[PDB]
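Record format v2
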Amino acid sequence: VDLERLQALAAEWLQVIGEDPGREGLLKTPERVAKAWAFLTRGYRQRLEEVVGGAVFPAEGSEMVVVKGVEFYSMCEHHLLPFFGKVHIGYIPDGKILGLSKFARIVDMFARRLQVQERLAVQIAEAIQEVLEPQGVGVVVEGVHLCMMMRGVEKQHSRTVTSAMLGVFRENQKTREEFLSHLR
Amino acid sequence: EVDLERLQALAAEWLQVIGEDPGREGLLKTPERVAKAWAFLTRGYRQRLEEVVGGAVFPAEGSEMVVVKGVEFYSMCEHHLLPFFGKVHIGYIPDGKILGLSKFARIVDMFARRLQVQERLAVQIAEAIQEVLEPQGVGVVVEGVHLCMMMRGVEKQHSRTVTSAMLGVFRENQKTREEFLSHLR
Amino acid sequence: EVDLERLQALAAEWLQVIGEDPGREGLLKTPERVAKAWAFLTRGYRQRLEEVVGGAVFPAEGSEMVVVKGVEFYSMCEHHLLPFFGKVHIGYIPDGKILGLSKFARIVDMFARRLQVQERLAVQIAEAIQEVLEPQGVGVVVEGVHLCMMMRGVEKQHSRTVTSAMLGVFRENQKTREEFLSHLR
Amino acid sequence: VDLERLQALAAEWLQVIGEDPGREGLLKTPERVAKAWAFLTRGYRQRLEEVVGGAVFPAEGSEMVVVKGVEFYSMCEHHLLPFFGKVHIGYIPDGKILGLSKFARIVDMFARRLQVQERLAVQIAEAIQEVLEPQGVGVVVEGVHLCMMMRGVEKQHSRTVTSAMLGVFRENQKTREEFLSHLR
Amino acid sequence: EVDLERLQALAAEWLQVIGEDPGREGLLKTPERVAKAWAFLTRGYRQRLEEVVGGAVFPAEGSEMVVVKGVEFYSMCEHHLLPFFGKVHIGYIPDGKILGLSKFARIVDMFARRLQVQERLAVQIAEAIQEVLEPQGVGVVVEGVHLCMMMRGVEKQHSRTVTSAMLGVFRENQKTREEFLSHLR
Amino acid sequence: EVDLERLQALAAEWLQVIGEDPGREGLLKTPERVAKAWAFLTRGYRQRLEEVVGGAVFPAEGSEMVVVKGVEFYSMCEHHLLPFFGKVHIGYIPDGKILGLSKFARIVDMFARRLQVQERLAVQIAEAIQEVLEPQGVGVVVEGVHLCMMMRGVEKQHSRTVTSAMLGVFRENQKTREEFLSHLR
Amino acid sequence: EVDLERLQALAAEWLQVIGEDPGREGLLKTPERVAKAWAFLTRGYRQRLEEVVGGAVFPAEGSEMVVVKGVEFYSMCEHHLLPFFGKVHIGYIPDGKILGLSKFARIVDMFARRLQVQERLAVQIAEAIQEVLEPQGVGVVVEGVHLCMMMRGVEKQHSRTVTSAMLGVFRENQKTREEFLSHLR
Amino acid sequence: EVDLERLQALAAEWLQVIGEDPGREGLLKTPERVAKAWAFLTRGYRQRLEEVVGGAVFPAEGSEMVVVKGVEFYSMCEHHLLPFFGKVHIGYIPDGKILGLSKFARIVDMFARRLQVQERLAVQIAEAIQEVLEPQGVGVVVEGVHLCMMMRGVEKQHSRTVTSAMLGVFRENQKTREEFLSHLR
Amino acid sequence: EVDLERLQALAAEWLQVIGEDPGREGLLKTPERVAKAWAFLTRGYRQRLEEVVGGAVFPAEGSEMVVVKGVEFYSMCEHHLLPFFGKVHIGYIPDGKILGLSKFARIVDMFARRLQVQERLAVQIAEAIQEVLEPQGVGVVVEGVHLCMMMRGVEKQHSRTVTSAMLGVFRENQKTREEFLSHLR
Amino acid sequence: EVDLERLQALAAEWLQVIGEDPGREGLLKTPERVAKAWAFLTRGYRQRLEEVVGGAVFPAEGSEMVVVKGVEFYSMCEHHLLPFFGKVHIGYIPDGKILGLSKFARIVDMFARRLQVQERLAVQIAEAIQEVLEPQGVGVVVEGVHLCMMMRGVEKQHSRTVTSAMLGVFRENQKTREEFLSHLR
Ligand SMILES: Nc1nc2c([nH]c(=O)n2[C@H]2C[C@H](O)[C@@H](COP(=O)(O)OP(=O)(O)OP(=O)(O)O)O2)c(=O)[nH]1
Ligand SMILES: Nc1nc2c([nH]c(=O)n2[C@H]2C[C@H](O)[C@@H](COP(=O)(O)OP(=O)(O)OP(=O)(O)O)O2)c(=O)[nH]1
Ligand SMILES: Nc1nc2c([nH]c(=O)n2[C@H]2C[C@H](O)[C@@H](COP(=O)(O)OP(=O)(O)OP(=O)(O)O)O2)c(=O)[nH]1
Ligand SMILES: Nc1nc2c([nH]c(=O)n2[C@H]2C[C@H](O)[C@@H](COP(=O)(O)OP(=O)(O)OP(=O)(O)O)O2)c(=O)[nH]1
Ligand SMILES: Nc1nc2c([nH]c(=O)n2[C@H]2C[C@H](O)[C@@H](COP(=O)(O)OP(=O)(O)OP(=O)(O)O)O2)c(=O)[nH]1
Ligand SMILES: Nc1nc2c([nH]c(=O)n2[C@H]2C[C@H](O)[C@@H](COP(=O)(O)OP(=O)(O)OP(=O)(O)O)O2)c(=O)[nH]1
Ligand SMILES: [Zn+2]
Ligand SMILES: [Zn+2]
Ligand SMILES: [Zn+2]
Ligand SMILES: [Zn+2]
Ligand SMILES: [Zn+2]
Ligand SMILES: [Zn+2]
Ligand SMILES: [Zn+2]
Ligand SMILES: [Zn+2]
């Protein structure tokens, strides 16, 4: 990402909205905004194999593993405004388990992009599927969208839930229900 | 369009009939304020579903249920012309198309900003979504408090009412319905 | 019509027998206050379901369940003449007819303002709704605390009692009943 | 209040906003609206002496009596939309105490009118002052305003607090603080 | 002490006057149950403070105030003969003497099990503690809900009343009173 | 007025610089959406305090403090152009004039819909109220979360920031300030 | 029955063996207080189910489940003679006969005021109810905290134990047991 | 020290006197378990303050108050030999020396594992800290629930007792004590 | 068992390498404290299940499942040697044998006080219970937070992990497992 | 720079001494993981306040207090090398200069990622802010839980520790300090 070009675009953005890039509080803003966006879009430049590293261990049992409450932050591709919340992951191993923290690294890889909450859930689930080839995986994303809160409809109490169910989580109703019950 | 002038005249007369003084300082601008307020509160009748959606329909990203919960709403009961309000929870399973999240709120407001009965509000919201997306199914749950039950009449204070509408797979598939409802708990 | 004069006489003698002084400043108007209170607390026996509903029956807007929860109630246990209170939750599936929301509260009060047993209260409310709407089904859940268990006798403080009545589809369809009960959680 | 005239005004109101007074759901609406408004404005027609009745008893002590959480419902005189919440009352007797329920009857007398929350607090306090002539009285009104929530600014998390302090509640900082602390 | 036979006869007639049938299966033993209940509910009039304390007064261990909060109480309002209940919080600074913790509850019950006014209940509890022990000060706060305000009359649901009595240093020193009250929040 | 066309051009270029495809289906309308969003998010610069208040200033009804709490707000930090949001609490003591409650919210939005620093937001809101009402004093407390601290950089998740501005009696009278702040707890 | 004198002597020797001074001011009346205490805490062994229930068995008002939850209880573990306490929840479906609500609490106390094992407590309570009402089924859930594992031994602080007993339809019917357990949630 | 054999014999006789069978399966090892239990529960009498604190006295890092709250504790009332438990909160201002955090808990256990009176427990803990650190002042607040008044006697369920001890600046300085107590809120 | 002298030497050097001064007043006894701590934290490797249970296996009292929830645990992740902690919930259906409640906690500590992976911890606890008792089934749920995820690396703050192991009927019958899991919500 | 190679060697030997197998699959990369973790956990010693602040000091917008609360932190106790964590709350009154909000979090981390005692942590954070801004005053409150008290030693579970540092007006002005502390409640 060309930080220098982002800075120039940000400086002009400030002017067009009626601000003064030369005033003290905005002097380093174009630079700060440029670096922030490089970080906020770093997900596009990451590789799944590197993100997981080699933290795949032999399964200790056959029961479902649930990693809940993984906070996430993303940007809606429609308004370029933040949407955030939590991601809950559940899976039944097929001989291999993932290092707990790698789930969060996978979440960040797909969240630090321009997104659609519906896509985010699917991409996370598919990534875990590719890495562990488990019997099944289930991912639930619950978030609040600033594009709905600070502008437009300006609704304050809303939150959205999206999910993706693969393998036995899609095929076995009881398995899915058990996973969702753990989140309640 | 609503005749604001007539509304102002009616409101001015309303004030005198209830025993107030339409001429006192604090009520002078009231007929005007009330007229504008009611035009806004009934603006939903004059809206078009096509314009409300604004073509914000996108290709589905997956096959799982999408649940948009806690969309606050405010309406007026057609029986007493007193506000009833709370939240609307929407759930649906796409059939190739998903809706921009905010459009669910815009649809809610379109049907809430009218004289209503909560049972109908749920149905109309669900039917609007079904028409716009033609999803596999849609479920709408409305939960609200009614001032006509709280500030007068029975004057109950702890009551809330839940109404809903289930279409397609939400009406036919028991487990799909149970799954949607469980997300709300 | 209750004989208020006779109630006052009985209450005045009650004050004497329990050891109090009916002549006290603070007790002078007590017999009169007690008479009026009990006339109100037992007014349910003198009400008619037809008048309580007031013809507030409208055409159904859909086929989904309507749940009116948290209708607070107050009653008197027929065993000790001590209050028991809490909330009544009502669920039903219409068969072409829906009831004005407040009428559920009026029906609750009609049966609550009598001497009762909680098990009966749930049943009578459910049967009343059934008679008025002839719905596909109706379910009533009553949850309350009993002062006769709290301020005397066993003197338990944390206990609460749940009673219910299920009619039509609420009794015949397992999933329907579960759906109603889940809405209460 | 002329219920018949209110009904006629309500029937026309329905027509002007684009509705049909003849449809089933609105048949009895003009009548219902008329009766509701007669009840909602009944406060103007009540008398303080009748509302209190004669429920004024000899004081049992000198300490502050606090009656909190008296729910209330009113109508803003500006938009004719409901504003509601709770009223908390505190006072130090001067030989006379009021029957607890009469505080609620006084609240209703002033709430069932077209109001301004700032006025409501003062009128309730002054009424209690006139009835008991206590050493002091304090009234706090906290409410939510539908004219701010369902229209206009459409803010959802706001609530307003107004109050009135008379006698020792105005003069004695510690007395006022003690009353307000009881509400926390 | 109290004539249970006269109470039973009064209760049996009470059932008749309010519109009930004393012959009903559910009301057969009611007059008897009601008489015994009221005998228990007014037992406080016949209790002696010296016996209530049972000589459970021990030497002080320190100078700091002792706070016994959350002592649940149940009483009857002398105006309507309907229950009012809640909690009693007690704070005191000893002067060489401390009371057995449970004795505070026994004192509460002694005064609560009578016909009362919440303002008096607080004063009588504090005065009793002041008599038994000879503390530097005593503070009693009573917070309760009144059924005469909830199940009839104004029918307000969210209200509760706080009454108190401050003696000795609790009345004298504002900082002591403030500290006692802060412990309750 | 804001040049939407230039904003769209800048946004379109922004998308390509960050590595995205401005031509893909979901991003086609993005430059347009972003342009309109930012014009709205910075609309506060173009508003006039006189028009915002709309002459909704009324005669004071009393002398006590008025507290309008929980007015939600959303702003953009001038340092990172990322949202910071939360609530604004306002307190003031009238000097002959009170403000229409909703105008407090309109004033908040006027200063929040700009590039800001939370410390300034509190001050400007307080100064605006002081100018419009010339009250005895005014206090404004802003509490918010900052996404620039949450979704990047230090990435702290539990932090909230409180800023305030106290004018007149709120700045000078300790007890008046304490009273205002206590209402917020 | 229980030889109080013998218990006092045993308690007196207990005080000296553990290292305390039986002649100390605060311990003089201890052996006496402990004796009466344990007589009360073991009174359940001497009670009779017939007397505890009395004649409080009324005709069933309906066929739906009756749930009496939150009946607090206190018992002593037979293994350490240390208290274990919590709540007992009872559910049952009548077969023509319903029990007076307070009798459930009296039955709980009858089996709780003994040396116990929580697994047994739930079973005995269920059997007692089954014997008295002969209902279609009974379900008992006991949830408590044990001081023997909190104030000594493992010294775990967050643990709670749930034991239960299901008879009749509560053991047979899966849906019935589920419905009962759901009411407790 | 404690003669475990003698306690076992006493516990064995206790079991038969109360009406139980000492030869019963679940009671065979009870007298042994009870003996060791009470030895542990009274171990505080045999501990030495110097050994409990060890050498964990470090140089003060500053002059501000240090507050260690929520230290759970369990003790036995000397009057009934029944447990009373809750939490101990400690606050102090150092005078050049600070204590290792865990030592506060060890001091609490030292005085808690004895036969006690809650008023004394707070005093002893405060004195111990004062003796070990000689700080500018120490404040101790003990809040607990007593089973002797919950599972027997008055059988009150919602009550909690607070006792405290203030030494040095915590007793002298009004603001210091207030600040400490505010931290607990 | 473990060489405390070697651990001390390793810890002393650890302090030096990370940039600290072992000679500092605050670090003088650290190597010693760290060695003893790790000896305690790995004590589970040297424990014997038979001794942990202490023959506390009693005859079953009923057939219903016993649920021991909220057993707090603390462990160290074998990957980073950083603590992970939370609670362990255990459910089982006996087959003539029930375990002493506290023994479940002792089994938890036996396996937690080792280097672990949460997935294994759940399995080992369940297998131990399955060996000691010969139940029809056992279910163990472990829920914990991991410092290696919170204080370093991804630094996520809101996450917690659930692992479990189901044996016997808990694995076989879905309704049994579901009932166990429902008791935890 | 820390010698990661040496840390790995020490960690590998640590695994051997505690009784584990360094050759295990799950422990092969542990020495490397532990080395990197500790380098990060002690990175605070290698940071410079000037670089941490990054010149993010701006002109003050007003004279009122700025409170940044809930900044979560994680540290290692210098006594046992076990984590202690919680939150840091910062308050200050500017003297012409304000700090970028995130810098407070960066300052917290600089001092937290070291071996510490909570009393020192509060002081160093406060002194750092003082040096950077030279404000009229600054106050820092640190509230945390210590694993060395929870997972070993006394094993207390409910305890939490509060430490603080007050400089300038926060130390000199009683009301200012109270105002800051009240914002934290
Ligand atoms: N399904 C879905 N829709 C989203 C997400 N993020 C997001 O902005 N949207 C929707 C919100 C809007 O309805 C839609 C864009 O609507 P639009 O093209 O008419 O633009 P707009 O800004 O004028 O819409 P609006 O927010 O004012 O209603 O994109 C997301 O993650 N999932
Ligand atoms: N089902 C349903 N009923 C409603 C709604 N809003 C609303 O006012 N109602 C009911 C409440 C009342 O029972 C009914 C009108 O009853 P009614 O014609 O006898 O008039 P009323 O004002 O005298 O009745 P009440 O409120 O005093 O009981 O309309 C709604 O959204 N759904
Ligand atoms: N102080 C005070 N103001 C009130 C109360 N009720 C109430 O509506 N107001 C205010 C809200 C509005 O700001 C004001 C009327 O404003 P306005 O004459 O400009 O009319 P408007 O409807 O266009 O105002 P707005 O609500 O859209 O902002 O009356 C109340 O109880 N106290
Ligand atoms: N101060 C005080 N007043 C009480 C208590 N209990 C109690 O009923 N009262 C009041 C409530 C009533 O206002 C009053 C009796 O009022 P009243 O003689 O007019 O009788 P009422 O039944 O018609 O009054 P109301 O409840 O319908 O308002 O007694 C109490 O403990 N303290
Ligand atoms: N006082 C104050 N500071 C603010 C506000 N909004 C906001 O971003 N800041 C601070 C956060 C940062 O510390 C600072 C910008 O720091 P900087 O110029 O070093 O830029 P940076 O992005 O590299 O800083 P950082 O967030 O990564 O720590 O602006 C606000 O409303 N008030
Ligand atoms: N499944 C599972 N994984 C665990 C546990 N404890 C624990 O540290 N892990 C994982 C977290 C990490 O992803 C993994 C070690 O990852 P790694 O070998 O790449 O080392 P790292 O420190 O660089 O990884 P990271 O935490 O920075 O992501 O071990 C546990 O109890 N269960
Ligand atoms: Zn968007
Ligand atoms: Zn209505
Ligand atoms: Zn208004
Ligand atoms: Zn009364
Ligand atoms: Zn920023
Ligand atoms: Zn035990
Ligand atoms: Zn005792
Ligand atoms: Zn780890």
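The domain at 1-54 of chain J is CATH 1.10.286.10 (GTP Cyclohydrolase I; Chain A, domain 1).
Chain J has two domains: 1-54, 55-185.
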